RNA sequence: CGAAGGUGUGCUGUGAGGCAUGCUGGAGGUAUCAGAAGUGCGAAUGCUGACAUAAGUAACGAUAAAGCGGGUGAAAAGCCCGCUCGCCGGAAGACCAAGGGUUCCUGUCCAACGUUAAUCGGGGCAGGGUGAGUCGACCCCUAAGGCGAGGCCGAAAGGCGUAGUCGAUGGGAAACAGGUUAAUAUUCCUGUACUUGGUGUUACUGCGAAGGGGGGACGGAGAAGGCUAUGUUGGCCGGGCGACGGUUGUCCCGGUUUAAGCGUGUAGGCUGGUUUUCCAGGCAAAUCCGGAAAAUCAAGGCUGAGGCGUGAUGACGAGGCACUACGGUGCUGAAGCAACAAAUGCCCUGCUUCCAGGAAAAGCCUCUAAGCAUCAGGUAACAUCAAAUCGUACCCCAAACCG
RNA sequence: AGGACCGAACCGACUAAUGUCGAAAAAUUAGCGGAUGACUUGUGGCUGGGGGUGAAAGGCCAAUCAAACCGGGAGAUAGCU
RNA sequence: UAAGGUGAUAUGAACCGUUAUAACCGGCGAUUUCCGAAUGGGGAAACCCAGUGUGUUUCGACACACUAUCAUUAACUGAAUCCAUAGGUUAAUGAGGCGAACCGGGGGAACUGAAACAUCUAAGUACCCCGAGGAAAAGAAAUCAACCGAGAUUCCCCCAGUAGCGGCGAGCGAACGGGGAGCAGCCCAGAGCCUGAAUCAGUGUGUGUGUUAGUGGAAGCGUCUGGAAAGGCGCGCGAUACAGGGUGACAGCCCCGUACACAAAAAUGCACAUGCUGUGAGCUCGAUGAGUAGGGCGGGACACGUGGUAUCCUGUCUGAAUA
């Protein structure tokens, strides 16, 4: 119904290079 | 965890109070805009 | 009760106002607060009478 | 000079309550409502004249109106001032 | 003597 | 609604 | 004697569709032929609402902990009372400031709120509650800083700043003890005090400023002495001698408290006083400050905790007695001393040392210019009057503040 | 005497575990560093976005910083999905 | 106007009025707390604290009025030096602030376009600031034209995506001339003759019209269905009124209205006539705008980007003739 506010980074900082 | 908002009536009034707005022309325009919008609270009133 | 007192002199106008304020305005108020007043319509009637006298005083005194 | 009419308007109504009753029977003091300003001098003069009694001292306080939640709406009562008037050994009302 | 308006269907048990 | 009288009442320590 | 819409059924066209009708619906609809489109939705990690799924699953927020009896109630592990158990005790106790803004107390109700129930609650509704000459704000003074008449500068807006005027986080007059409310008290009551001004009376007298001088007026660290708060023990007073052995005894339990003010002036600290004369210094003057001379005595003066008297043959006081809407009310009331220990608190904005050298202004004291000196004004005593306005509930390491 | 030593309050955050739809949008438990100083803290001021401040990390400037936030130019532009 | 009323949620209680001062509507008046330009000083807006002058119950203490800044004018005072000036005080007049757009002026982007990008474009746009009005600005040729002629400015349709400008790219883009709306011309730089002599602005009177309350306003009945008809059926009437709204289903004839005809004690805008105040007709002669025009340098505006570049404006340095 209402958009969230904190909006944390859901993606994990782990690049598979 | 200390948070950003630490209330203080004296600082609030002296910073965003009605007389603070009237001191400068920019503040006077802020009041003019909010009168036009019809806001019930012109400023932060004690 | 509007033109009856129009022709009276200022001395009587001040006198009638004082007794209007003194009696039937203060006494009625105390009666109403204590709950002993059943005819509450007197309060408004007395208040309007006081207004009438004051209106005459202004158009008599000075201007 | 509007002192006479002023004294006729400072007093609004007597106050009735358990604290009022015990104060009257014990301390011989009357508690009553007054105008918002109602300086202590004006209250003292008004009680002396209108009630034809002798008074010793007057203590005043301001009561803040409560916030009430009527129906779907929020409202606030008006602030009023009550005064404790201490009569001398001779009391009438 | 204060008039009481009709409240919401989940009103207090008055 | 708005109260405007936050006067100080310091009881003697 | 039933429009739109909704919901079924039966016919019909190669299609999008159309037609008739059963039930609900309740008052609008529109042929044919033309005209104009916000003219057709399944997708855009589309937008809004509603409702599913995981699922009756995880979780129910510090592992400080509960047990029982009685009461109320429709219902009691959570509410009330009682008896045990456990936890904090430099706090998880008692106070504030800031910030909240009635959350405080009583009556009543359990829908929602409370991560469960709830008779309970910081929940709902109603009523009640905040009492000041001495507390604080207000007010007088000023710091950083703000504003800023004229003024300087700048295309305009505006920037800076003098005189001024604001600005407490600082300086400035004054109250303590006991009692009382369901909820306020250093505010109410009893007792005993204190401060600043106006007016009036009496006796003396030169008074008189934004002007001069003094004062206010200030750092860090360190050490000792004198103390008090407070504590422990003895004595004294009241009570007890005791369900498992002993306990009239150097035994056990409780109490043994009293302020501000006023008078005295101490431990300690500081400084030499008094008289006379003179001086282009203190943007004018000066009896004041500063400076220079002499005579004289050797003391004086200032500051100062605590103690001691009065305050007070008063208050408080263990306990006892009489009634309890059985929550509590009323009456009565003995002793109320000494010794020892002792602070981070007071003497002490002191003293001794160190370099980094440690606000301002007013209140107050004091000296004069202009002006007036039969006045006015000032000093001393007494009497009277005034001290307004605003905050005063409650939380305040927290369920009431910021998250 | 000491930017002296040990160590509480107070300030900080070196290690580990727990917690990652947590009690908490950086915390808790057990240890750990400073703790008379270049210390810490209350209240009130001043510095404003190509600017401030910085014992200097591109750190911080209201949970947002290699250029804050709000409104406007604005329906910017998008040979891309 | 009136037989009803005391605003609404919102009932109640207590009352007013019904032939006229109940209530309601309109004009003109009175009251009009505190904050806000805020204006006596200050301030955290709705608060605190004053001075002076006028009148009064216990001295007590009260009530009212005034007291901001700036500009102009007048008076009185008044330094460094005689005079003087600056400065100071007093009194009067005006301004201050707010408000959606439109108007003029002072400043002035970037994104974007050019398939990049710097000239250019976007664009004198957004935005900021100043000033005034009901409109503003502009406006009576040192203008065009072509040697034929028109005669202020402004706005609309053509001319015309034309002539030109342009990394001659993207883009920008006139004028002359024609057709319309509307038309109005004057004054000072100066003396004389004649002097209300027209036209204007401000204050009285009178006519007309309009606004601010309002008044009258035509004409239908019976049966059927139905909770109820305004519907169906049958027969009538009004219409300078079937525009609308309401009324138990769809009303010209039930109600409010509508066409139409009237209405103003008092205040008002507009167009006229008649008084007062103030500048001011007509004729002769003369005069006829100088640091200006123009020029050098640097920019800006004209469609016109410095190009062969006319014309206008300006920062800087120069600088005529005057009929």
Closest of D73, D3, D15, D80 to residue D42, by C-alpha: D3
Q: How far is B2 from chain F (nearest CA, A)?
A: 25
- How is domain B1-46 classified at the CATH fold level? Helix Hairpins (1.10.287)
In the 4-33 segment of chain B, residues within 7 Å (Cβ) of strand H are: 4-6, 8, 10-11, 14-15
| Strand I nucleotides in reach of protein CB atoms, 7 A cut-off | 9-15, 21, 29-31, 36-37, 43-47, 55-58, 61-63, 97-100, 129-130
Closest of C14, C15, C44 to residue C29, by C-alpha: C44
The reply to whether D78 Cβ lies less than 7 angstroms from strand I is no
SS3 C3: coil
Measuring CA to CA, how many Å separate C35 from each of C26, C47, D33, D81, E3?
14, 19, 15, 20, 20
Could you tell me the residue ranges of all domains in chain B?
1-46
Which residues of D touch chain C, with CB atoms under 8 Å apart?
4-5, 8-9, 11-14, 16, 33, 50
Contact C25 D8 (CB under 8 A): yes
Whole-angstrom Cα Rg for chain F: 11
| Touch of A by C (3+ CB pairs closer than 8 Å) | no
Instruction: Measure the CA–CA gap between C23 and C28, rounded to whole angstroms.
Output: 8
Instruction: Measure the CA–CA gap between C38 and C31, rounded to whole angstroms.
Output: 9
Q: Show residues of chain D in contact with F1, CB under 8 Å.
A: 67, 74, 76
Could you tell me the residue ranges of all domains in chain D?
1-93
Q: Show residues of chain B in contact with F7, CB under 8 Å.
A: none
Walk across the sheet containing D55-63 and list its strands. Answer: D11-14, D29-34, D80-87, D55-63
Closest of C63, C56, C62 to residue C9, by C-alpha: C56
- What single DSSP character describes residue C43? H
Whole-angstrom Cα Rg for chain E: 8
Q: How far is D76 from chain F (nearest CA, A)?
A: 6
Tokens of C63: 């201007």
CATH architecture of D1-93: 2-Layer Sandwich (3.30)
Resolution in A: 2.4
SS3 D14: strand
Instruction: Measure the CA–CA gap between B32 and D32, rounded to whole angstroms.
Output: 45
Residue in F with minimal Cα distance to B8: F6
Beta bridge partners of D33: D13, D82
What does the buried/exposed string (b/e) look like for F2-13 if buried means 16 or more CB atoms within 10 Å of the residue's CB? eeeeeeeeeeee
Closest of D45, D50, D39 to residue D14, by C-alpha: D50
Q: How many CB atoms lie within 10 A of CB D57?
A: 11
Place of tokens 């005194």: C61
Q: Please check whether residue D72 is in contact with residue E11, taking contact to mean a CB–CB distance below 8 angstroms.
A: no
| Strand G nucleotides in reach of protein CB atoms, 7 A cut-off | 48-50, 95-102, 109-112, 123-133, 135-137, 147, 157-158, 168, 181-183, 185-189, 387-393, 401-403
Contact D13 C30 (CB under 8 A): yes
Beta bridge partners of D30: D85
Which method was it determined by?
Answer: cryo-EM
Tokens of D53: 């009694």
């Amino acid at each position: 119904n209402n958009r969230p506010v904190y909006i944390p980074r859901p993606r994990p900082p782990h690049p598979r290079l | 965890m200390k948070r950003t908002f630490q209330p203080s009536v004296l600082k609030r009034n002296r910073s965003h109070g009605f007389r603070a707005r009237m001191a400068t022309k920019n503040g006077r325009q802020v009041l003019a805009r909010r009168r036009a919008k019809g806001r019930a609270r012109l400023t932060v009133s004690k | 009760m509007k033109a009856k007192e129009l022709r009276e002199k200022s001395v009587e106008e001040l006198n009638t106002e004082l007794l209007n304020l003194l009696r039937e305005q203060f006494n009625l108020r105390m009666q109403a607060a204590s709950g002993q007043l059943q005819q509450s319509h007197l309060l408004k009637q007395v208040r309007r009478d006081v207004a009438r006298v004051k209106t005459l005083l202004n158009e008599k005194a000075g201007a | 000079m509007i002192r006479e009419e002023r004294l006729l308007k400072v007093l609004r109504a007597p106050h009735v309550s358990e604290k009022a009753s015990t104060a009257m029977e014990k301390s011989n003091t009357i508690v009553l409502k007054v105008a918002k300003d109602a300086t202590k001098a004006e209250i003292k003069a008004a009680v002396q004249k209108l009630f034809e009694v002798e008074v010793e001292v007057v203590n005043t306080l301001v009561v803040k109106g409560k916030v009430k939640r009527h129906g779907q709406r929020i409202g606030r009562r008006s602030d009023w001032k009550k005064a404790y008037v201490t009569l001398k050994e001779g009391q009438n009302l």
